[PDB]
């Protein structure tokens, strides 16, 4: 019951070429405004709102690390997960400081400036690298989404832009959230940032999945929420 | 014959995603700079050096119009061509001004800037659309790259970044250059902009039946030649 037809089984098409190489903007572009805001909210959550602990699990990390940059300030161990091994390869390749890795330095640096500009990029990248000890398959369709890997129960589950990437129906989303509950201590945080399933459905789904919302903000809209498992 | 593995039968991968949405700073500065240089160059070649006339044919246009922006000020009519029908369809969305089309604004603005702001963006897009009359499939391995479609001989043939997209071997390149000649009036201009061995390109253009007027590094090269 997914609606999205953008996948790693899709062919590269001409519009993909255009977007990679002939897109230009300013800090005032729509697209750049969204990323600005995501980064601001992750900073606010993990640095200003008190979301911290021993262990955080990112569910649907794709090939991306920007979503962990503030998070490595507040968590001793981070675990990154995605269903697709090809995404995992991008992450591993960056985590090992391999030369084929994507260059995040511009985003890293931006995040440093946001945090009470102290730190320079290389130290931030080191800390995130020190923090992640495991890169894993996840399938949230299963009641044990990390499978047979044994993980202590976690203090935070994070997930960014998975609705936007898959467009699942309401029941699929629900089931996914309920299954993530299995990874989390009682009282542990769930942090979600995603695009709009509308506001009332997202809340309903989070409640029914077994979580109490403490913060929910909306800005086609980008939402952000923090909740705790009962 | 060709060494590039990047085609529309490739599958989208995680690096393509990353490059669409997270590519900033130095890697993307370089691209803006490379593109600014091409634009300046086409401005030089078409608006300053008097490469002009009635008919220009762009060979291997891709899904892209940036390479025509200055050309439409010097040519009454432009014909855009590419082997891939998917490219043609992307160009058509933009020419027919459909709202699903790609937004070229900041490239259009940058060219209006290079031309002393005589004109504002929309007027410029209008001049380009009015100038493009036909969108045609082309196959440069054939003696008549345009098939059964007959055009008068052009004043100029333009080709942008095709060596870099396909990585042909030399003879393949030389024979394609010759087959293109068939579209061009005697004495007509060939303008190539591509990735760079300098003499290999030079020898290919000579052998294909052209005289080089100007060659320049901007390794990205630019070259104006004339059909013998």
């Amino acid at each position: 019951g997914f609606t999205s037809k953008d996948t790693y089984l899709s062919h590269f098409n001409p519009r993909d070429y255009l977007e990679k190489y002939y897109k230009f903007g300013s800090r005032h572009s729509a697209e750049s405004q969204i990323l600005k805001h995501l980064l601001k909210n992750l900073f606010k959550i993990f640095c200003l709102d008190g979301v911290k602990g021993d262990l955080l699990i990112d569910i649907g990390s794709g090939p991306t690390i920007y979503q962990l940059l503030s998070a490595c300030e507040s968590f001793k161990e981070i675990v990154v997960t995605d269903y697709s091994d090809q995404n995992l390869q991008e992450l591993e390749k960056w985590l090992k400081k391999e030369p084929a890795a994507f260059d995040w330095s511009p985003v890293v640096t931006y995040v440093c400036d946001l945090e009470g500009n102290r730190v320079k990029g290389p130290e931030k990248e080191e800390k995130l690298r020190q923090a992640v000890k495991q890169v894993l398959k996840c399938d949230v369709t299963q009641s044990q989404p990390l499978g047979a890997v044994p993980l202590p129960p976690a203090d935070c589950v994070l997930s960014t832009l998975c609705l936007d990437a898959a467009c699942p129906d309401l029941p699929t989303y629900c089931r996914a959230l309920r299954n993530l509950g299995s990874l989390l201590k009682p009282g542990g945080f769930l942090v979600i940032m995603d695009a709009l399933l509308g506001r009332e459905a997202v809340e309903a789904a989070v409640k029914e999945a077994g979580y109490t919302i403490e913060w929910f903000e909306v800005i086609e809209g980008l939402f952000s929420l923090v909740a705790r498992k009962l | 014959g060709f060494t590039s593995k990047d085609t529309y039968l490739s599958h989208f991968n995680p690096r393509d995603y990353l490059e669409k949405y997270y590519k900033f700073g130095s890697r993307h500065s370089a691209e803006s700079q490379i593109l600014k240089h091409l634009l300046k160059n086409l401005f030089k070649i078409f608006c300053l050096d008097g490469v002009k006339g009635d008919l220009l044919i762009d060979i291997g246009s891709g899904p892209t119009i940036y390479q025509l922006l200055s050309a439409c000020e010097s040519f009454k009519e432009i014909v855009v061509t590419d082997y891939s029908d998917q490219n043609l369809q992307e160009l058509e969305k933009w020419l027919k001004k459909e709202p699903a089309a790609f937004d070229w604004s900041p490239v259009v603005t940058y060219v209006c800037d290079l031309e002393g702001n005589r004109v504002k963006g929309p007027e410029k897009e209008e001049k380009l659309r009015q100038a493009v009359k036909q969108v045609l499939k082309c196959d440069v391995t054939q003696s008549q790259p345009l098939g059964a479609v007959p055009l008068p001989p052009a004043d100029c043939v333009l080709s942008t970044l095709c060596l870099d997209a396909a990585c042909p071997d030399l003879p393949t390149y030389c024979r394609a250059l010759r087959n293109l000649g068939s579209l061009l009036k005697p004495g007509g201009f060939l303008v190539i902009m591509d990735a760079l061995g300098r003499e290999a390109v030079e020898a290919a253009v000579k052998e294909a039946g052209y005289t080089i007027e100007w060659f320049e590094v901007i390794g990205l090269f630019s070259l104006v030649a004339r059909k013998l």
Binding site: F2, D6, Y8, S84, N87, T172 | -
Partner: peptide, 8 residues
């Protein structure tokens, strides 16, 4: 599969 996330 999706760019990030389920089987696709």
């Amino acid at each position: 599969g999706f760019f990030r996330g389920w089987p696709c």
